[PDB]
Every structure is written in C-alpha cells, then in structure tokens.
Amino acid sequence: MAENGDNEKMAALEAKICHQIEYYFGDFNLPRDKFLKEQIKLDEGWVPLEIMIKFNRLNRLTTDFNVIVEALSKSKAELMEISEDKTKIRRSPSKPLPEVTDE
Numbered sequence: 001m002a003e004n005g006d007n008e009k010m011a012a013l014e015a016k017i018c019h020q021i022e023y024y025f026g027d028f029n030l031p032r033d034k035f036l037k038e039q040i041k042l043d044e045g046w047v048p049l050e051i052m053i054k055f056n057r058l059n060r061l062t063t064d065f066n067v068i069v070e071a072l073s074k075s076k077a078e079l080m081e082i083s084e085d086k087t088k089i090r091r092s093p094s095k096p097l098p099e100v101t102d103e
Helices: 008-025 034-042 049-054 065-074
Strands: 088-090
Touching: 008 049, 008 065, 049 065, 049 088
Parallel strands: none
Antiparallel strands: none
C-alpha cells in the first residue's frame, strides 16, 4: 500500500543537477574558477561532489551524492570525466575550455 507519485520529479531534477555542474565547468567558471582550481590542483584533478553538494549553488537543489552522480553519470556525463566510484568530478585536461562572451 503506497501509491505515492510517479517519480517524474526525479526526471526534471536529474537535468537540474547536470546544469549546476555545467555552471562551474560549463566553460564559464573554469576561466574564472578560484575554488575549482583548488579541487583540480588538489591531486589528479578529481573533485569530490562534496564541494558541489556543499555549495549553495547546487546544495539548494539535489545535493544527494547518489542522485547527483546518477543524473550527471548518465546525463551530460560526456562533457567532463567521472571516476569509477561515481563520487567525484573533474575537467577533461585533454579538452580545451573556451571562455563565454559577454553581452
């Protein structure tokens, strides 16, 4: 006995999580990412979703390591690269990142 909903909200939430990661890596933040530079410089460039799930930018949406990774792991998981545990994100060092134009 339950019949809660259709889990459709997760479908729209999956894209929202990928869009947030796109904000820091979407070529816009990389050209001026001070915090991202710290995670990428840390070691190997692999960043932990803790930085993403703790920042008000994304923490105000999913913040669920399992939900955040699942959405980006299969949706828009081609832009950057993800480790095997699916609990970290990094910018493709072998891929160029262009700056966005203003106005």
